[PDB]
């Protein structure tokens, strides 16, 4: 069980996603990988507190060395900037280590 919070700062040609992964399960997490797809053509241009990989619309986010341990109930935060054009919709589905997440 996982839950993602998707925070957004928005401007004319770019945006920031400030993300929270919530370990809503009863088991601790040691190393995590978050996957999602962009719905609007967005492209990652900068990442922090993680390693972000994109191919086409698909994005993979891997933990940094200092934030891979999420206790049961705890959170981890990462962020990235991206470019966008036209529209900038949020992703509608996320998966953490294969597990489909809810969205706050």
UniProtKB/Swiss-Prot annotation:
SS bond list: 2-101
Superkingdom to which the source organism belongs: Bacteria
Residues annotated as domain CBM2: 1-104
Task performed by this protein: Hydrolyzes both cellulose and xylan. Also has weak endoglucanase activity.
Other comment: The linker region (also termed 'hinge') may be a potential site for proteolysis.
Family: Belongs to the glycosyl hydrolase 10 (cellulase F) family.
Protein name: Exoglucanase/xylanase
Gene name for this UniProt entry: cex
Region of the whole protein represented: 381 to 484 of 484
